[PDB]
């Protein structure tokens, strides 16, 4: 059901990556409530550098954030960006598959065949045609 699969779409994908990171020099068979806790702190962390680095750049009259807006955002959160080079040096990391597209055929919609009727002059040509 794609209606409720809007947020589940990449939340269960996040859970796949969470498992990989909790096994990276980590434990096994995690408590269920401890995984939905930590992936709630992960979503709230990406959403907080989203709101605060946008606020720091728009305070400086800009619209898209540079590197100097995130290294002040992470300072105000307490993280340090100079630990990322070392984390990449660690060859201990993996890669997760991207979620598949819900509709493979893009736009297969061909409506129906049976054109009939025209348009009265108060309806321009760019509105849909009158049906059969």
């Amino acid at each position: 059901n794609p209606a409720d699969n809007y947020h589940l779409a990449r939340r269960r994908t996040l859970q796949v990556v969470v498992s990989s990171l909790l096994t990276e020099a980590g434990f096994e068979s995690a408590e269920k409530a401890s995984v939905e806790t930590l992936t709630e702190m992960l979503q709230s962390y990406i959403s907080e550098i989203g709101r605060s680095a946008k606020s720091y750049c728009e305070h400086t009259a800009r619209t898209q954030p540079t590197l100097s807006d995130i290294v002040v955002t992470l300072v105000e959160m307490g993280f340090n960006v100079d630990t990322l080079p070392a984390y990449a040096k660690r060859s201990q990391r993996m890669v997760i598959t991207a979620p598949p597209v819900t509709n493979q055929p893009v736009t297969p919609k061909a409506l129906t065949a049976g054109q009939n009727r025209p348009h009265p002059p108060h309806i321009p040509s760019h509105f849909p045609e009158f049906p059969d």
């Binding site: 794609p2 209606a3 699969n5 809007y6 947020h7 589940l8 779409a9 990449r10 939340r11 269960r12 994908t13 859970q15 796949v16 969470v18 498992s19 990989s20 909790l22 096994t23 434990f27 096994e28 068979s29 995690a30 408590e31 269920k32 409530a33 995984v35 939905e36 806790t37 709630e40 702190m41 979503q43 709230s44 962390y45 959403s47 907080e48 709101r51 605060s52 105000e76 959160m77 307490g78 997760i96 598959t97 991207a98 979620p99 598949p100 597209v101 819900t102 509709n103 129906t112 065949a113 049976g114 509105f127 849909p128 009158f130 049906p131």
Partner: protein, 408 residues
């Protein structure tokens, strides 16, 4: 009403924290205050539901109602320093009452990544054409005078075009017509004339065995059935007989070549037979008639082998239990029939082609019966107790099925 939370839940929370020996008036003090806050937020989350016009509610109205009351919407952790998690929410905790409380880490990687749905797009239609709502799929639903037909002059032209397209002169025409038969909401009140055209057609179309005319009519029946708007069980007295003669009649055309063609019509007939019965099965009537007639057709002696093959197919596609009870005590008879065709040098008949098709179909159905409720063992010569028809090749088919199961 001022229905508060229970106080016997508030003492459990207090003594599981280190605060023991709390009075009842101390414990009641919390319940009235806590219930008001839940009541203050749910009345305030109602603002976001009415203003977002959400209605179905996406996990998030309480996150904005909490942020509106200057409380963190965070659920499952509270930061006293407030800086890594400000009033941005984390989407709650996906927790249940009937949960396992301890899963495997490998299980959450096995959890498939759900599909990101389609993005929001603008499509246009018509609610009203000069006052009248169209029936498009984007919309919900003593001399005397002479009488008029109950069909419109257009509806009658539509019926003529759909029937002249459904006799399959062009694939595009037939396909579009079949789609229209399976989707038209106003195709009721034309349905007697479609049922009569089908029924009458098959009966004067088996006088000369015209396979396309029949394959097109069976596809028309299948397109009539999956239409959700129309009411069909007032017309299956004209439908079942058509599918019956498409399965149990004398078909004396090309022995091997037309067998392939008429076996596709057989597949269509057996499938549409069950779907027709599914739309009306109450007690006995249709299901009882089908079972008794199929059994009598099978137990017929010196039966036309085309009729035999068609009735065999129809009996086979009836589901799980039907072959579990109806395809058991006749295994010896099936083997005897194949042996009778094998003896002799006559190959210009359809009896041999009929025999090979019947044996292959019966052997495949036996394979799930062997797989579903038996364990494989002695696959070399035990099948010689069942006249030795498929034997080791049947065993190899069972092994291929087991390999497919292992792959699954």
């Amino acid at each position: 009403s001022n229905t508060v939370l229970p106080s016997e839940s508030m003492k459990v929370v207090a003594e599981s924290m280190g605060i023991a020996q709390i009075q009842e008036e101390t414990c009641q003090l919390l319940t009235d205050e806590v219930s008001y806050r839940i009541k203050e937020i749910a009345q305030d989350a109602l603002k976001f539901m009415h203003m977002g016009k959400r209605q179905k509610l996406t996990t998030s109205d309480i996150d904005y109602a909490l942020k509106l009351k200057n409380v963190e919407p965070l659920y499952g952790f509270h930061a006293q320093e407030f800086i890594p998690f400000r009033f941005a929410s984390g989407g709650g905790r996906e927790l249940y009452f009937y949960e396992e409380k301890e899963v495997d880490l490998s299980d959450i990687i096995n959890t498939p990544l759900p599909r990101v749905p389609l993005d929001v797009c603008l499509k246009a239609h018509w609610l009203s054409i000069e006052g009248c709502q169209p029936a498009i799929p984007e919309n919900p639903p003593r001399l005397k005078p002479r009488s008029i037909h109950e069909l419109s002059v257009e509806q009658q032209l539509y019926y003529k075009e759909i029937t002249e397209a459904c006799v399959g002169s062009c694939e595009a025409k037939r396909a579009e017509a079949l789609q229209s038969i399976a989707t038209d909401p106003g195709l009721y009140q034309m349905l007697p004339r479609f049922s009569t055209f089908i029924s009458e057609g098959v009966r004067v179309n088996v006088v000369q065995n015209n396979l396309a005319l029949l394959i097109y009519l069976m596809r028309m029946v299948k397109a009539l059935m999956d239409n959700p708007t129309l009411y069909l069980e007032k017309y299956v007295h004209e439908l079942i007989p058509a599918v019956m003669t498409c399965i149990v009649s004398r078909q004396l055309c090309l022995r091997p070549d037309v067998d392939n063609h008429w076996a596709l019509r057989d597949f269509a007939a057996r499938l549409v037979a069950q779907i027709c019965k599914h739309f009306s099965t109450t007690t006995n009537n249709i299901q009882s008639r089908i079972t008794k007639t199929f059994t009598k057709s099978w137990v017929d002696e010196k039966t036309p082998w085309t009729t035999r093959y068609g009735s065999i197919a129809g009996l086979a596609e009836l589901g799980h239990d039907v072959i579990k009870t109806l395809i058991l005590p006749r295994l010896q008879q099936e083997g005897e029939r194949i042996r009778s065709v094998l003896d002799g040098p006559v190959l210009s008949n359809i009896d041999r082609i009929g025999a090979d098709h019947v044996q292959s179909l019966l052997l495949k159905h036996c394979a799930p019966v062997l797989a579903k409720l038996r364990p494989p063992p002695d696959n070399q010569d035990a099948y010689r107790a069942e006249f030795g028809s498929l034997g080791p090749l049947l065993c190899s088919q069972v092994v291929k099925a087991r390999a497919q199961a292992a792959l699954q």
